[PDB]
Amino acid sequence: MTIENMSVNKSFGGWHKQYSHQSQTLNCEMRFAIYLPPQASSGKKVPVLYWLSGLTCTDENFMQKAGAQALAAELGIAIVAPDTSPRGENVADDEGYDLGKGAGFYVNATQAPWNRHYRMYDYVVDELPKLIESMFPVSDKRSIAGHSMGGHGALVIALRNADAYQSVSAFSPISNPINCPWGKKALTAYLGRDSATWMEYDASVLMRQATQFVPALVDQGDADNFLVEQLKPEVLEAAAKVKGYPLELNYREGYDHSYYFISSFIENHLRFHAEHLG
Amino acid sequence: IENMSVNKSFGGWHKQYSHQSQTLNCEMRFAIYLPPQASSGKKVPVLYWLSGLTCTDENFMQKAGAQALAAELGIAIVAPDTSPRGENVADDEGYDLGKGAGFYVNATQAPWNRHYRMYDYVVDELPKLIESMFPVSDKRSIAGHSMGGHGALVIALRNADAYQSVSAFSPISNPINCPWGKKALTAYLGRDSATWMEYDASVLMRQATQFVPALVDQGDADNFLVEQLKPEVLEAAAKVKGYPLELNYREGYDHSYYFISSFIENHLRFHAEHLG
Known part of the structure; x- marks a missing residue:
């Protein structure tokens, strides 16, 4: 399971990082993003919130636009944002925004050609x-x-x-x-x-x-x-x-x-998870 | 003026407007965040935000996370575009010149003096x-x-x-x-x-x-x-x-x-203090 850093941006005293890795489950190369809060660097092991994005999205949309890092840093929660589908030239696709790449629907596909790569359930x-x-x-x-x-x-x-x-x-x-x-x-x-x-x-x-x-x-x-x-x-x-x-x-x-x-409501969602994670 | 899009944000409104600019002789897009206090009959003060090379009005509105404290402090925010836009407007395919690269000056040199008065616009x-x-x-x-x-x-x-x-x-x-x-x-x-x-x-x-x-x-x-x-x-x-x-x-x-x-909150409180 080979993995390598792609990017690093400091954010509210912690770290937004992108990695690519070789996914065995999806049989392809995947990009995800993690936010590590400031308390990650201070010895404490932090809880994780996994964030699943919608149609057309990559890991970037949530990280850049959701405004979640500020309350993740204050509350001490790591955020992991997977991609929405397998990626790569061998990966089945459909020109449609609502099917294929950007659209894995977080299932374990049993039908060909999808069953070659689309195990977004098992991956997540x-x-x-x-x-x-x-x-x-x-x-x-x-x-x-x-x-x-x-x-x-x-x-x-x-x-x-x-x-x-x-x-x-x-x-x-x-x-x-x-x-x-x-x-x-x-x-x-x-x-x-x-x-x-x-x-x-x-x-x-x-x-x-x-x-x-x-x-x-x-x-x-x-x-x-x-x-x-x-x-x-x-x-x-x-x-x-x-x-x-x-x-x-x-x-x-x-x-x-x-x-x-x-x-507008990601704060409230983060407090709700901090409560149950604590 | 024409309202192109509207998105409720932190109890207020993110809005895209296009208008016809006399100073830039083209069709322009800007964005405004109006906080809740704007719809409470109180006239709010304004922070103009100027973006960097290659940006539109969307980058700051979507990525800066300024709406939460603008809504709290009662500041309206206006994000102009970074240059004139339209097929009537002079361009250079370089990222650091022409469209997305106005440098907030009034151009005196051809072909730029016809469209590139972003100092006057702002x-x-x-x-x-x-x-x-x-x-x-x-x-x-x-x-x-x-x-x-x-x-x-x-x-x-x-x-x-x-x-x-x-x-x-x-x-x-x-x-x-x-x-x-x-x-x-x-x-x-x-x-x-x-x-x-x-x-x-x-x-x-x-x-x-x-x-x-x-x-x-x-x-x-x-x-x-x-x-x-x-x-x-x-x-x-x-x-x-x-x-x-x-x-x-x-x-x-x-x-x-x-x-x-990471620091936009310190900036909004700095500006609130001086606008008040």
Whole structure:
């Protein structure tokens, strides 16, 4: 498992770093970003928040635009931002913004040609966390969060792995991918048509049958253009009523889908995770 | 004027406007952050932010994380573009000349004198436009990065009564004596240095009679520090007449918005103090 620094920018007394490594799970070369807070350099091992980004994103978007480093440094949380898909000339793609590169939908693809590289689930749950721990001053305590496609992945991963994560939050998540266009196209391509394996990757289906509980916080913009068609936050609200799952879901009046929304509430999300990580 | 886009941000509004500039003879884009207090009937003061080479109005708005403390302190922020834009506008495919590279001067040389009056745009046309179209007071400060830092200090030093305070991140301190500055000044104003002296932060500061409170942060691991930015000349220029310049070298900090973001809070509080 070969890894090399690509970049370093000091940030609020700590360090934003990009690395490339050879991913065995994704069978390709991957870029991720880490933010280490000032308390990482002062002997203390810090908790980690994994951040999953949405369609079209790389690791750069969150790190540059979310404004999270300031409160990560004050609270003492490492942030890890993976990429959104395998990358490389051998990696299956689709010209569509909503399928392929930038669009791995945090699943383990079983169908060809996707099954050659698209194991973004295994990468985020298994490989990346073991690589981070062996390399950086991070504790065993981890949480997960993300935006849109990334909110889908964060919720799915936390609901399937409740022992391994202390908390989960999401902005504008794809709540019910088995019944929305983005969801249907990508789960069709990667898992096969209709296919019961879809139910392993749908937050609102999983939250209904859920046993062990992970505290969940969800922020949704009122003025988000994808609210009705893609995101379906009200299906996640209804999923939580079945078992009494610990979901807090907030509708923010006038907020859109953008990093201007995310940046506006990332503090609150960071305090919520610091609470459960502490 | 036309509102191109709008995004709620920290209880207020990030907005992109395009308008037709008479001073630049082209279609211009600027961005404004209006804090919550703007929609509470109180006229807010304005910080103008000038960006560096290759930037639009989007870089500072998306990367600096200034909205949280602007919303807290009640400051409106205006980010002009860094040059004229449009296929009617003269360009050079060099990154350090023409589009994205205005150097905040009034060009007198062809082909540049038709479009490249970014000094006039920032000092006259844009503020008259902000004050007529937005609930803002006539109180303003100016700040910038690199080329924008050069632009901020030069504008403040030459318009001392118009600006309450000035700050900069990694300014081009002494443009008459760096490659970026000579190339742009030669192209925009011609080869005779006598016309450059009015566009050099260090030269103006050394002769300054009227003080505008000044704060500068410089990352000491900045790849442009030695060749282009020359902060040491701005320190030396402040010693001559006792200019109120606070200048910090920040250990390990680079040129990027990771540096700017790390200290933008100190800058917003500096400007709040002087705007109030």
